[PDB]
């Protein structure tokens, strides 16, 4: 058949099984100065920046897309 | 048959099985500069930046795209 | 069959099985100053900066794309 | 057939398994100075900056990409 037959046996952790988060905490953050530029952070990454991923079976036929982003433009702006 | 039939097995620790995440912390974060440019940072990435990333059978044709993101200009502006 | 025919048995330990993470910390973390230009930082890389990765079975076909980002201009701008 | 029939026997470690990751620290962390360019750092690389990468079984037909990232330039910028 197609899909998952292997289960998930007992446990007794905090936060067991597949894709859980517990206690994240983004500090001094994310912080960008006037006219700075940054397009396409993290445009179709997979596990990134501090990020877990996790797979059993099988994976087939993946494109995830993020299209044009460049050119921009900030020109004699005052204060 | 298509996709998985192994089980996981029992278990005693805190956050075990597939893509947990436990106690993360940015610290002082991410901080960008005024006039400071930096397209495509981890566009397209597995596992980057403090990241996990674990499989058990089948990845056939992954091609996940981040489009154009160059080109960008600050011209002339004061303060 | 297409897939996982693998189990992953008993374990006693906090954090195990596939891709999990516990206890990052990114410290002082990221600091661009004004007018600095980085493009392409970690574009389509594969486990890097302080990363974890792991596979067991077969892997067909991965092209992970990250397109231009070169050309950014800082122009006559002041303070 | 196609993926995965070994499997992951019985352990008693903590995070132990595929791609696990436990108190990873960044330290004084990264710092990039005013006017300084540095494009490509760890593009398309695999295992690069304190990382892990192991692997059992296929990998056929990998060619991840990241393209051009040069010719930035800061002219006549005050302060």
């Known amino acids: 058949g197609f899909g998952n037959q292997g289960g998930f046996g007992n446990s007794r ?15 001094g953050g994310m912080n960008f100065g006037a006219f700075s530029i940054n397009p396409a952070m993290m445009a179709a990454a997979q596990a990134a920046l501090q990020s877990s991923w996790g797979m059993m079976g099988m994976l087939a036929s993946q494109q995830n897309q993020s299209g044009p982003s460049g050119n921009n433009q900030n020109q004699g702006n005052m204060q």
Do not use: E, I, P
């Not at 952790?13 to 500090?27: E, I």
């Open 13 to 27: 952790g905090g936060g067991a099984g597949l894709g859980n988060n517990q206690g994240s905490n983004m500090g």
